[PDB]
Each structure stands twice: as C-alpha cells, then as structure tokens.
C-alpha cells in the first residue's frame, strides 16, 4: 500500500509498504530518496514519535496516511 512522508520542505514523497513493515524499514527507504541517514530521521504521526522497532500497524498507519519527517538536529 502507499503511504506518504512529508519531507523537510513540506514536500510529500510516497513509499510502498506493508502494514507489518517496521519504522526501521521505512527509515531505510527514506534514506534512499532523501539523503538523510536513519539515525538523523525522526518520524512523527498522530502526535507521536515513531520508534524503529515497531511496525506501521502498531501506530494505526493505514493506506495513504501521512508521516512527518523531522531532521534530528
């Protein structure tokens, strides 16, 4: 399914994922298209910071949900 990630400039990218994919997996893909190492990525969804070892289903992330990327500064 597709999900969206709002980048640093507010731009949206798409990711093809499975509900069982981990945040780690998602961060890996984001590194591929944005040039930001996983360790420097912080993802926020529905008022929560997402953790590397949990899955999209764990956060009720569904098809076409939008996650927010924040640079770990």
């Amino acid at each position: 399914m597709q999900i969206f990630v709002k980048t640093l400039t507010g731009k949206t990218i798409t990711l093809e994922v499975e509900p069982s994919d981990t945040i780690e997996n998602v961060k890996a893909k984001i590194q591929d298209k944005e040039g930001i190492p996983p360790d420097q990525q912080r993802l926020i969804f529905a008022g929560k910071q997402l953790e590397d070892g949990r899955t999209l289903s764990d956060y009720n992330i569904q098809k076409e949900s939008t996650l927010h990327l924040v640079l770990r500064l």
């Binding site: 926020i44 529905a46 008022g47 927010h68 924040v70 500064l73």
Partner: protein
C-alpha cells in the same frame, strides 16, 4: 520595529501550521505558546 515583528511573525506562522498537522489532537493555542517559547550556525549542523 513594527516590521522585524512582522518578519519574526511570518516564519512562526509556517512552523505553527506544521506543528498542528503533526499534533492534530492538540489545542492550537497551546502549540502557539510552545512555539513562541521554543528555541531558534545550526544549519552548519
């Protein structure tokens, strides 16, 4: 000074919109007081 205020006021508006989207269930007025008290060289970081 009623110009520098407008500039400082314009950038904050942007951040406020983002924050509200990240934290949909939170009170917008609360986010505003938080943003105003919130921090900022760094770009080089």
């Amino acid at each position: 000074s009623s110009l520098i205020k407008k500039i400082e006021e314009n950038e904050r508006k942007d951040t406020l919109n983002t924050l509200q989207n990240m934290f949909p269930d939170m009170d917008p007025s609360l986010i505003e007081d938080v943003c105003i008290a919130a921090a900022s060289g760094p770009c080089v970081d």
